[model samples]
Target: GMTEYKLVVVGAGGVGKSALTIQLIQNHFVDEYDPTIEDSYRKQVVIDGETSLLDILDTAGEYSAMRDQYCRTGEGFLLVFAINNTKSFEDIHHYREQIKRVKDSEDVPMVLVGNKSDLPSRTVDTKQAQDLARSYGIPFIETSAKTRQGVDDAFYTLVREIRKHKEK
Candidate 1:
């Protein structure tokens, strides 16, 4: 039997949730900004030598009404924000709070993602994102959907965290 995990990719608009998901599952990068309502993808991956199935949900940033529903169903989350957008970074707390409220656990399996790392005009520094992740006691990773840096690492870490939480 294969273990299964449900993960949600969430963040403000233009944060590259779709791009990251596409890049990870399809091994291709998407350049355009297409707003998503809700999209699901399934993939078979081996993490830490364990085979498992991943069902990822890519969500619309403006769809606040549906977020609680997602939180209730998601076992893990990739909370993403653009490195060059301060508002997006600040909005991360809102999403985190919603998840905590819905899951009723401060220790929900999640990763703080700083996207668009390939951009040179980034406003959110690594230390800032790292500090936020440290405050939340979660992992922080920077990724470039264009360059594919840290994409797989972020999802893998989130799945591993989910498994760890499930064990506890």
Candidate 2:
């Protein structure tokens, strides 16, 4: 048997957190998007190459309670932002602050995910997200749940980075 890991997907509402979770776990894309219920939890992803039991803590946009709970864990955090929504992209800084308030390990890992990359005409530039993540020293990636592009690579790459850190 091997150890499993917990992964949290977060960001402003309507950034496709649930869709991303569904795509990664069930290998299906949920087209209809909706706000998450309070403390809505999904089963672990049993994919062989991914975190065998990756539990995605899907929190609500308005639920401060769930956000507080996530802060208590130093587990992986995938910050999702919509490429077409400037407000959503600009709000990543707020999430970054929240992650800091909850975790004190000084090195909790994070993956910057720009959801809805397929709709490039309506979203933020890829370079903008990359530069921002690089500036903060966090990894950056763009993905689409609709097409399932860059989905696995995004998480797998970050997990590899995590293992590298632990190996040291």
Candidate 3:
């Protein structure tokens, strides 16, 4: 059977969710700010030695209630935040908590992504995010959609996490 991952990208209003998702889907950067209502993307990729399909939902922060169903059904999540915004980093907790809350499983596969790493004035330090990831028992990565840094690994790593969870 071809494994398929239903993934949700969740974060604050300006944390580059569309940028990250589109970078993976289209391999291009979206620099302009456009508030996402909800967009779905699909792509087939190889992780480790296995081919898998990724079905991603890029959601709107405004549609909190609407996204709860995605949270419940999504197999994994990309909890994105902006490296240049401390508030966005702080807001990651709410999205993370809500996902697990809706799923009723703390073992939900997730990746904590610090996006906009192309920015020079970084407000949220890498080490701080590292510490948070360590505590959460998840992977935290820094990404720049502009430069395409860590964008692939962030999604790939989350897929690996889901497989890791399944092995148990």
Candidate 4:
């Protein structure tokens, strides 16, 4: 038998959730205008020492702003934001509540992703994002879709959290 993870990426528009997932799955990126709705991708990635499958419910807006197929089945969530986009950060707050409300779990396996770190300027402070994750009791990391930095860590961290949540 093989192991697999059902992961979801949630965020506002221009947050790079699509880029992050596409980069991981395709080793490439997508532009801003590509319709981001009800997308999915899976890749067999090695974590720690084990090779496992990662099924990501990837794309824009809320899980419901998109679909219920994701909300009910996703075991782990990546709450994303673009540091250069302020409204994206502001919209991130509602995602956590939506996920919690849908999953009926206050301590669901989730992580905060501050994406687009390659940008020279940021509208959302790093520490501000950090504290949000801190208060949410989840791991936070900055990622660059261009440089491929923290890309693995973001998904891997969520995988680990899901593992822990399952272990519990």
CA RMSD per model (angstroms):
1.6, 2.3, 1.5, 2.0
Q: What TM value does model 2 have?
A: 0.86
Model 1 gets an lDDT of 0.90
What are the per-residue Cα lDDT tens digits for candidate 4 across 82-151?
A: 9998898888789899888888667799999999999888889989998898989999999998889999
Kindly report which residue stretches of model 1 are placed more than 4 angstroms away from their true locations once superposed.
62-68
lDDT of each: 0.90, 0.76, 0.88, 0.85
Off by over 4 Å in 2: 38-51, 64-66
**Runs of candidate 4 exceeding 4 Å displacement:** 62-66
Against the true structure, candidate 3 has what lDDT? Answer: 0.88
What's the TM-score of each model vs. the native?
A: 0.94, 0.86, 0.93, 0.92
Best by lDDT: 1
Looking at model 2, the pairs that clash are 83-123, 83-124, 84-122, 84-123
Total residue pair clashes for candidate 1: 0
Q: After best superposition, candidate 2 residue 150: deviation in angstroms?
A: 1.0
How much lDDT does candidate 4 score?
0.85
Residue pairs in clash, model 4:
none
- What does candidate 2's lDDT look like per residue over 77-167, in tens digits? 8888999899999999998887877776667778999989888476588889989999778889889989999888777766665665567
Whose lDDT is higher: candidate 1's or candidate 4's? 1
Model 2 weakest 10-residue run by lDDT: 42-51
Off-target runs (Cα >4 Å) in candidate 3 are: 64-66
